[PDB]
Amino acid sequence: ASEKVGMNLVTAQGVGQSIGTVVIDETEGGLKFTPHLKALPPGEHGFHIHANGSCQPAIKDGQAVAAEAAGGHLDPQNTGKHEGPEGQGHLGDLPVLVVNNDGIATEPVTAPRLKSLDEVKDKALMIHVGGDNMSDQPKPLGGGGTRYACGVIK
Ligand SMILES: [Cu+]
Numbered sequence: 001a002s003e004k005v006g007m008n009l010v011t012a013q014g015v016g017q018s019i020g021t022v023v024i025d026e027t028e029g030g031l032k033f034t035p036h037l038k039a040l041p042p043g044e045h046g047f048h049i050h051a052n053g054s055c056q057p058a059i060k061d062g063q064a065v066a067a068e069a070a071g072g073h074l075d076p077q078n079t080g081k082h083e084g085p086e087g088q089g090h091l092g093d094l095p096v097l098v099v100n101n102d103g104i105a106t107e108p109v110t111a112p113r114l115k116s117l118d119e120v121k122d123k124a125l126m127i128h129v130g131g132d133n134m135s136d137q138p139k140p141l142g143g144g145g146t147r148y149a150c151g152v153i154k
């Protein structure tokens with residue numbers, strides 16, 4: 001079973017344009033991700049699910065949060081540490097969205113972290129500025145807590 005999640009760019013103003021969806025397709029090895037996005041910085045980008053579904057910013061002390069109405073990366077009970085190479089953390093954490101040198105991603109990959117669209121039908125996807133393996137600096141993901149795009153599942 002499958003759902004085509006339309007992701008828009010986000011950058012402290014809130015929802016921008018789109019440049020790609022990602023198709024989510026559930027299987028017995030979980031959520032198969034197949035991206036089709038252009039116009040990103042042509043590296044590698046962390047992939048999360050977030051606690052609410054809302055690609056919208058917050059404003060406080062004369063300054064804007066990138067996009068955060070979606071909540072944290074689905075972080076109910078833990079310590080603050082992120083799910084990764086050792087220990088334990090949040091269940092909304094997923095393998096890194098590789099992009100080719102020309103700024104386009106297509107990699108058919110899978111997250112066994114969840115195994116039906118019914119597990120995400122109230123949430124957002126989020127394409128994160130860094131890849132996603134660290135908790136071990138005074139800010140998590142090595143500072144990669146920022147994001148280029150978001151998409152509410154519908
Ligand atoms: Cu995130």
Ligand SMILES: [Zn+2]
Nearest residue numbers: 073082090093
């Ligand atoms: Zn996390």
